[PDB]
Design a protein around this nucleic acid. Structure first.
Lengths: 141, 61, 55, 325
RNA sequence: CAAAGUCUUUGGGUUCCGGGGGGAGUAUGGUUGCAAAGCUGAAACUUAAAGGAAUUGACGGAAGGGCACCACCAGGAGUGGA
RNA sequence: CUUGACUAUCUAGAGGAAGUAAAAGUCGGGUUUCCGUAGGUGAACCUGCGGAAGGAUCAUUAACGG
């Protein structure tokens, strides 16, 4: 088992650090490959421009059409598929428009039903989707 | 070469016939390794062309 | 091929909200939450009824 | 009738895949072998049970679906519609004991006859025995039509269905009078010698297996019972059929025979008793087949989780228990 | 399982090594190899599970067992043909 | 700063090979489970060679000396 010497510190600590890399979380956090391939790139939100409306077909058992929007980010130029939330919120978003995109919740997992979609629209042209759905504000263009 | 080794064959007859089979196989595992890298290069480029679809060019409108 | 956008929002009959008297706030509300749970206790044999329980 | 013309093909064929290997096919397996649409096939099954297409089975542990009598019948007609042989339904139907006769019409409007085998051991074996019956009957029907015999013309076979030429008449058992008894008699006697020449004996050559076309032409149907002339009792089945016709015309029409055919001719005719080296384009095909199989196996496991019925039963009892506490 | 025990009553010395399943023991680099290959060895991405022990027996295309004139045998009367 | 060599990046691109929606457009039985290796058209799988069980032990077994 474990060496339990009094002069064994260097063996211990080095072993700990060596083994730390097999942890999926730690490696993800510290290797700097996930921080570079991430389209947001250490960002809470990004802001992109809409290219097209894409109706992604839902992952097996739950049979529906999830209304997403193919944004192209401004800050680097990566393409993203991004899910537009509540029903009839797709209608607010028009092609060639500013969109504030955020994560979904699981830090890089497709959340539930939608396959390969990590991101959700929060704002269209600087007004929130939550407001526009609830009829609180008007959308400029 | 599919010749049954007859008893009266000596050195130079046996030795050249064996060296022929050695050279068939040497040419053969070169040809097998060549196919092994052909399939490896074609699987890897089709892996990309299918993973490309997951990200973009799949949906509707 | 199928795919409407917000079908079920535009098909629902728009029912206007009723006008009720305002809710008490803060300490007043807590007071009302206290007296509804611990003060006017109505006896029951095994307690199987909830607070919002409609039938 | 047939209104639904998309998902119903794929789901019902998937039942037939499971029917050949196992008894009652679970709903988990169906969606995996019908990978074109995912999840929404369970509501198609609920439309299939409305008709006599599939039957439900929830015995003790066995949970799933089996194919019915009529459900097996619709599958053949759906295939015959794609082969452009059947379009609409003619109503003159002779409901028998071993088979059902349905009049069919094509794109042209030309009316043909369709046979559907109804053999009635579990229903799985019964809908497999009807499969072998149609393949055997179509084999003789092709064999005799090519060899000058007055039989219905074979068109197409699908699982249990046989499309034949529409010869419309009355069976010999319900015939009062024939205008020319002698010429009809000699026609029939020739056909026993004709079959014996081709190395065949009918076995049950009676008045119950013969149809007259306008009282001129004798038509022969029903061929699964036929035997070889190599059989030890070959002349017995030959003579029994002769005496059956000899006595019938003497009984019904009062015609006594002048000609007594007992010739053994085997065989002057066809014996029908038997009745860098790898190119990049190939590399593409082979890599494609590998990648499809990896995706197909994963889709099977996604569909196997549909159990939806198991979750519904568990939820009902928990609501009852919590309310009673 | 008398070690796989003397482990929340957790520390006799010490070496190697695992951290959901896949991708994948794949790429790439290095190195050894005449070669075939060996050692070392990722990520992008994908997935709610992969699995280990045990337990009843829905189903056996199991084998056996036994049962019934709505099954047969030995039979009698028919239906089916008018 | 100029001159080449190794490099690193940014940005135009004929053509190549793809893939992707549109065309119902034309034709059409075997297997116990493995392991390592070599060959069989790459992999699988099959076979040869050497390993495993992670594979369901009935029965017989007292003399042995004139």
């Amino acid at each position: 088992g474990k060496c339990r010497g009094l002069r064994t510190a260097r063996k211990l600590r080095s072993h700990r650090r060596d083994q730390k890399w097999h942890d999926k979380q730690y490696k993800k956090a510290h290797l700097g490959t996930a921080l570079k391939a991430n389209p947001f790139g250490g960002a809470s939100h990004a802001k992109g421009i809409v290219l097209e409306k894409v109706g992604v077909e839902a992952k097996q058992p739950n049979s529906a059409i999830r209304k997403c929007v193919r944004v192209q980010l401004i800050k680097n130029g990566k393409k993203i598929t991004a899910f537009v939330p509540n029903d009839g919120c797709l209608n607010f978003i028009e092609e060639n428009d500013e969109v504030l995109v955020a994560g979904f919740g699981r830090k890089g997992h497709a959340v539930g039903d939608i396959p390969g979609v990590r991101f959700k629209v929060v704002k269209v042209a600087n007004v929130s989707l939550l407001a526009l759905y609830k009829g609180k504000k008007e959308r400029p263009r | 070469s599919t010749q049954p080794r007859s008893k009266n064959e000596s050195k130079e007859d046996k030795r050249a016939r064996k060296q022929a089979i050695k050279e068939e196989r040497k040419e053969r595992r070169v040809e097998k390794k060549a196919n092994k890298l052909a399939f490896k290069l074609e699987k890897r480029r089709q892996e990309k062309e299918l993973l490309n679809l997951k990200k973009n060019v799949e949906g509707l409108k | 091929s199928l795919a409407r956008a917000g079908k079920v929002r535009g098909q629902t009959p728009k029912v206007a909200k009723q006008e009720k008297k305002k809710k008490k706030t803060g300490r007043a509300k807590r007071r009302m939450q206290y007296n509804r749970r611990f003060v006017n206790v109505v006896p029951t044999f095994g307690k199987k009824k909830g607070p919002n329980a409609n039938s | 009738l047939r209104y639904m013309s998309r998902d119903d093909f794929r789901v019902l064929t998937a039942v037939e895949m499971g029917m050949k290997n196992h008894e009652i096919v679970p709903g988990s397996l169906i969606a995996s072998i019908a990978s074109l649409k995912h999840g929404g096939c369970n509501k198609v099954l609920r439309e299939l049970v409305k008709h006599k297409l599939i039957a439900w089975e929830r015995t003790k542990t066995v949970q799933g679906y089996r194919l019915t009598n009529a459900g097996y019948d619709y599958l053949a007609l759906k295939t015959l519609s794609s082969r452009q042989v059947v379009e609409s339904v003619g109503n003159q139907m002779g409901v028998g004991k071993e088979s059902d006769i349905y009049i069919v019409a094509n794109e042209e409007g030309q009316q043909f006859a369709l046979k559907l085998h109804r053999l009635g051991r579990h229903n799985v074996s019964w809908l497999y025995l009807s499969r072998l019956s149609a393949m055997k009957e179509f084999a003789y029907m092709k064999a005799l039509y090519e060899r000058k015999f007055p039989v219905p013309k074979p068109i197409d076979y699908n699982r249990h269905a046989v499309v034949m030429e529409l010869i419309n008449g009355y069976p010999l058992c319900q015939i009062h009078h024939v205008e020319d008894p002698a010429s009809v008699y000699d026609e029939a006697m020739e056909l026993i010698v004709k079959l014996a020449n081709h190395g065949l004996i009918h076995g049950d050559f009676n008045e119950f297996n013969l149809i007259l076309d306008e009282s001129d032409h004798i038509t022969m149907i029903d061929f699964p019972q036929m035997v070889s002339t190599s059989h030890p009792n070959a002349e017995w089945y030959f003579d029994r059929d002769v005496k059956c016709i000899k006595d019938f015309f003497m009984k019904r029409f009062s015609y006594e025979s002048e000609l007594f055919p007992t010739f053994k001719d085997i065989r002057r005719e066809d014996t029908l008793d038997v009745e860098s080296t790898i190119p990049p384009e190939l590399v593409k095909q082979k890599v494609k087949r590998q990648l499809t199989k990896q995706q197909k196996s994963a889709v099977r496991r996604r569909l196997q989780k549909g159990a939806n019925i198991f979750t519904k039963q568990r939820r009902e009892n928990m609501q009852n228990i919590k309310s009673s506490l």
